[PDB]
Design a protein around this ligand. Structure first.
Ligand SMILES: Nc1nc2c(ncn2[C@@H]2O[C@H](COP(=O)(O)OP(=O)(O)OP(=O)(O)O)[C@@H](O)[C@H]2O)c(=O)[nH]1
Length: 299
């Protein structure tokens, strides 16, 4: 049983779009300091923190306001966690709530036995410098609290998105990209994988990287993996890792051959003695095109 937690107004927009795409066998948790922003979440379970400290307003782009507001509500966080084997902390770094509360939600889930994954977006360079250093030094707090942290800088998204994209649809794509990271790993566990397998990939590895590839036509099984190995969302290239995870999602047409094909183009590009596993997701609503998702652990 897996549970997802959306810290901040950012992460909450992701959890909103995450069920808009329809996701199975993952229980949902939203967390916010703003009272009218958590009003809009579709999550099964909602929690507000810092009703004493913010009293309804957003935590006003201050990290410590979030950090101590979560300490105040330590109870309801412990409530929603226990009963879960794996915990996802999807939260947009930058704001007061996310940059302070999410590092706490994590370290609770870590010392509560469960597995801990941080799927966080860095902010744009177009949001000032002081907003960045917060988010970046908040990744620092995130880094040592979770098991693996999947940094997705939002500046890498400018290549995938248009030049014409406005402000409130530039984050619509960021929600979709945070979805691909969790859904990529979630759809594998609950022709499945062993859970104790992922324990070897994730446990106390550190900084992680994500790559996305989509291919349509004739030679889909290869053009996908190639575009995934050279995705802009990867800072470096995938060779550094001591462990790789691969998700191949395709429609009814997907052949057991195509999977082994794509898996070897990735295995070639990775280090020669790497920990690697992979799975096949049959998603009937997909027409002909498929999608490959790559995770790199331990640099
Ligand atoms: N995934 C995603 N990230 C967003 C979205 N909007 C903003 N962000 C990122 O998240 C950062 C902080 O925004 P919020 O999460 O809404 O702020 P907060 O965590 O609620 O903290 P406060 O400033 O106190 O409200 C920004 O710097 C953006 O980079 C969004 O709609 N989706």
């Amino acid at each position: 049983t897996l549970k997802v937690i959306g810290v901040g107004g950012g992460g909450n927009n992701a959890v909103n779009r995450m069920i808009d795409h329809g996701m199975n066998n993952v229980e949902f948790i939203a967390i916010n300091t703003d009272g009218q922003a958590l009003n809009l979440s579709k999550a099964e379970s909602k929690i507000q923190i810092g009703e004493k400290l913010t009293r309804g307003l957003g935590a006003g782009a201050n990290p410590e306001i979030g950090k101590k507001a979560a300490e105040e509500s330590r109870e309801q966080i412990e409530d929603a966690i226990q009963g879960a084997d794996m915990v996802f902390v999807t939260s947009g770094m930058g704001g007061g709530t996310g940059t302070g509360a999410a590092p706490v939600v994590a370290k609770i889930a870590k010392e509560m036995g469960a597995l801990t994954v941080g799927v966080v977006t860095r902010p744009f360079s177009a949001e000032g410098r002081k907003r960045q250093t917060q988010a970046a030094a908040g990744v620092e707090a995130m880094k040592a609290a979770v098991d693996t942290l999947i940094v997705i800088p939002n500046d890498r998204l400018l290549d995938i998105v248009d030049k014409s994209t406005p402000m409130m649809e530039a984050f619509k794509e960021a929600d979709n990209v945070l979805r691909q990271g969790v859904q990529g790993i979630s759809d594998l566990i609950a022709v499945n994988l062993d859970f104790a397998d992922v324990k070897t990939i994730m446990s106390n590895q550190g900084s992680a990287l994500m790559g996305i590839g989509v291919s349509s036509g004739e030679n889909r099984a290869v053009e996908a993996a190639k575009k995934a190995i050279s995705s802009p969302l990867l800072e470096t290239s995938i060779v550094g890792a001591q462990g790789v995870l691969m998700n191949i999602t395709g429609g009814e047409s997907l052949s057991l051959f195509e999977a082994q094909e794509a898996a070897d183009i990735v295995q070639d590009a990775a280090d020669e003695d790497v920990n690697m596993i992979f799975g096949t997701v049959i998603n009937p609503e997909l027409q002909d095109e498929i999608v490959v998702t790559v995770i790199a652990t331990g640099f």
